[PDB]
From a paper:
Among these is CYP126A1, a P450 with ∼35% amino acid identity to the cholesterol-oxidizing M. tuberculosis CYP142A1 and CYP125A1. However, CYP126A1 is highly conserved across pathogenic and non-pathogenic Mycobacterium species, suggesting an important evolutionary role for the protein. In conclusion, we present the first biochemical and structural studies of the M. tuberculosis P450 CYP126A1, revealing novel substrates and inhibitors for the enzyme, defining its relatively polar active site and its ability to adapt structurally to facilitate the binding of bulky ligands. The CYP126A1 structures reveal a dynamic molecule, with the BC and FG regions clearly affected by ligand binding.
Residue numbers in the entry: 6 to 74, 80 to 178, 193 to 414
Write the structure that this text describes.
Amino acid sequence: GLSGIDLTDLDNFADGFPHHLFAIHRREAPVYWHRPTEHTPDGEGFWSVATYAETLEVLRDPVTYSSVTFGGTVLQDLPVAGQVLNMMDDPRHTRIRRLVSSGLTPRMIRRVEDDLRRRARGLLDGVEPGAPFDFVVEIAAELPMQMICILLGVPETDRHWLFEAVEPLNVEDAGSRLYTYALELIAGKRAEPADDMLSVVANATIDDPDAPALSDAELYLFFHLLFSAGAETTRNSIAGGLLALAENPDQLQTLRSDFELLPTAIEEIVRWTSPSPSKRRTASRAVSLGGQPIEAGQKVVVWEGSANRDPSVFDRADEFDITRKPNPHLGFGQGVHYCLGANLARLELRVLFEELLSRFGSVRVVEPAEWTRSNRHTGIRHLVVELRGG
Ligand code: HEM
Ligand SMILES: CC(=O)N1CCN(c2ccc(OC[C@H]3CO[C@](Cn4ccnc4)(c4ccc(Cl)cc4Cl)O3)cc2)CC1
């Protein structure tokens, strides 16, 4: 069973989150030492955590399970190793998280909502009914990218040009373009503050020596990482949502008939899709997790993607149900690092599906979904659909 399963082998992730591997994991060893293979980061083994109770226990103890432990086009050769908020512990984490939260202003969130609703309408009004198209390419990717650019204060004219560097053309040039751009943007917001999250965070000076404000290079890292990954997780929830609804047409009809069902439906979409299905932590001290001793310094990987289908907590865990109650999913994390984007993601999903379902009661997926090759993101690269009134 587990002894021949390699969770670092991305071939196991190329076709979607491998739920069947995680059923084995939960049954055989909730908490398991995963020896390093040819495919494993740093040739370092780790504790792999697949059940809900133990995953939640790790998330809820940031003192024992430290978040101090980048792909894409992110610059790999900066002179200094910056931190990003999700890799911080207290005291610095608390101060920076509070700062980022203070950047999520009501006026800016209204701007996102208005822009989303306009764009969602524009895009859906442009669909040719019944004609196949790639939902990811034409709609799902666009809306969160615009949201994340509004949040980070990126002028509209620069957004797709930036998205090309974030998601390509070579890695060096991409990263260099983004670093220059980010640093110009930061400089501009310091000279003329704007009502956006990046401006608030960039303009901060903190007097605690153990909790300094973000450096310029750290602000670039934050910009790049959140742009890429906040856009990606959100689009994956949208695309995976459409797919789940298309595979359960009776629920689609129920939902489209009563938008008061949408908030609960959105929680089930996040549970089902679990776009960010794994996290790293490092044990800071000897401790036991589910009766397994762990030593200080050892890596821990929790799998929310597995926890969210744990049959000890979710009845009929392997079925999608838009009316699921209760639904204590971990799709947005839990504890001190809980997703600061959770309401933003849910807004994206709510507006898109309201606009989509108002117009189309028939959703057909006409080619197999193509999944991205990753165990850090569960995502759909292409989803070819036909939308009709129905
Ligand atoms: C459906 C889309 C999204 C999903 C599934 C998701 C998931 C998550 C999860 C599971 C965590 C916890 C990380 C950890 O425990 O180490 C997290 C953290 C975070 N999320 Fe998201 N996220 C989504 C969208 C967004 C968006 C749109 C934003 C933009 C504000 C955002 C901003 C953040 C930030 C800043 C953190 C780190 C918080 C901290 O470390 O204190 N996320 N997200
Ligand atoms: C060896 C092994 O088995 N494995 C390798 C390493 N593995 C892994 C590595 C990194 C990782 O990263 C998740 C954390 C970091 O990523 C985000 C994604 N995100 C973005 C917005 N909301 C969530 C994030 C949050 C805030 C900000 Cl500022 C920026 C980001 Cl990138 O959460 C998740 C998993 C898991 C699989």
